[PDB]
Amino acid sequence: AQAEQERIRMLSEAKSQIADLVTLTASRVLGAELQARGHDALIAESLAAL
């Protein structure tokens, strides 16, 4: 049981790293795709909200 817990401990850091990396790559896709989709066209949403 303790060895299973210890393996999960290493997996827990790996799982958190995997989740953070996946979400950061999803964000960077927006960041990379932002230049092609439009660099400064985001002001339209803010004008409607404000």
Place this chain on the structure above:
Amino acid sequence: EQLANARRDYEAEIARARQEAAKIVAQAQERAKQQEAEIIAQARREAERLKEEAR
């Protein structure tokens, strides 16, 4: 004579019991320590190996 005869048997029976029981001590301690060390060995065989395989 009766007092001496009783004393001889009492002296013969008094001493040897502790020495004979000491024959227990070696074997019983060896068994108990070996089995506790086997418990430790069973605990340690999984601890390192499962972590290495889980890596």
